[PDB]
Amino acid sequence: AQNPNCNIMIFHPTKEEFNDFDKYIAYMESQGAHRAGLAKIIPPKEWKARETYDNISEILIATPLQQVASGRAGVFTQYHKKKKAMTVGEYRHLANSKKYQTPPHQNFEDLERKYWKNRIYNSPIYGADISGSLFDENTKQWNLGHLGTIQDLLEKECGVVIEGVNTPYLYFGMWKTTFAWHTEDMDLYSINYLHLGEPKTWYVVPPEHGQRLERLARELFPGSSRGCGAFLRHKVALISPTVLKENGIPFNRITQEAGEFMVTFPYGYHAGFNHGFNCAEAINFATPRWIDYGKMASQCSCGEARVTFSMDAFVRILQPERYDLWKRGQD
Ligand SMILES: O=C(O)CNC(=O)C(=O)O
Ligand SMILES: [Mg+2]
Ligand code: NI
Ligand SMILES: [Zn+2]
């Protein structure tokens, strides 16, 4: 069995190996990459996402989210308070202000310590979940706006034609902006490209141990657990690496820098934070190996998780018994 300790693997494809996306994902899995839940891919040195980022400041963040924390430093929830629209140029200036900028630090480890110690005492503003792409249309390799769609994968594997579309999303981050512990909708893959700016630190639980994290989360967030049998789908709970270690939960960590891709694998729980002003782009995708995970994925039916149009068909075809109750949640 490849990668039995479920370590995060880092890949360096050549320009020739960068042509066929599906084939390279299948290669990484042949080496055990999926067992970690997360892999890093460093693009060939010849590749570029686009020529420059000099002209992005007029993108609108229509609903910036202020991430307000509750709890203790290592075990907290966050809620998202909607703020007035601002441009990317306005947001970058805000990120760089004395109130919100990254503090002085020695290295990534010192910054990680400061994040866990101090996150809860601040409310950073995240420009998340913005439909759009920063890949140049002429970039032919690993262009997240040109991937094969999940609807087409389901059709190729299972023969059923379904409605829905699959497009990327932009994330504009600042110091302390946070992504809570989650897997993807329908336990899909995700791919994330850090276009510019400061790094993003990731934490991940191997898929084979995902239920250990769920059981800890039910203990740590007991009212949330009673409210919903899949409350990590709400994407609100944080648990520190210190707490995870104290409770014996297997995980790994890695820092993504500008110019690098990360891939999350089906049912790989992940969480993390931004080091400073940055812009990432991400999209979900599927492979043949996903289908069985999609069939088994938990669902939030309490009504909180409220998700895309395209998830309807996935539930309806892969999870027909759940369909009824899940749609009551969505309506
Ligand atoms: O970058 C973020 O805020 C969150 N991204 C993801 O969870 C992902 O790419 O799967
Ligand atoms: Mg612009
Ligand atoms: Ni994710
Ligand atoms: Zn729920």
Swiss-Prot record:
Organism in which the protein naturally occurs: Homo sapiens
Gene: KDM4D
Molecular function in Gene Ontology: chromatin DNA binding; damaged DNA binding; histone demethylase activity; histone H3K9 demethylase activity; histone H3K9me2/H3K9me3 demethylase activity; metal ion binding
GO cellular component labels: blood microparticle; chromatin; nucleoplasm; nucleus; pericentric heterochromatin; site of double-strand break
Superkingdom: Eukaryota
Portion of the full-length sequence here: 11 to 341 of 523
Residues covered by the JmjC domain: 136-302
Amino acids binding Zn(2+): C228, H234, C300, C302
PolyADP-ribosyl glutamic acid sites (modified residues): E16, E17
Catalytic activity: N(6),N(6),N(6)-trimethyl-L-lysyl(9)-[histone H3] + 2 2-oxoglutarate + 2 O2 = N(6)-methyl-L-lysyl(9)-[histone H3] + 2 formaldehyde + 2 succinate + 2 CO2
Signal peptide: none
Keyword Zinc set for record: yes
GO biological process, one term: cellular response to ionizing radiation
Top-level EC class: oxidoreductase
Name this protein carries in UniProt: Lysine-specific demethylase 4D
Presence of the UniProt keyword Transcription regulation in the record: yes
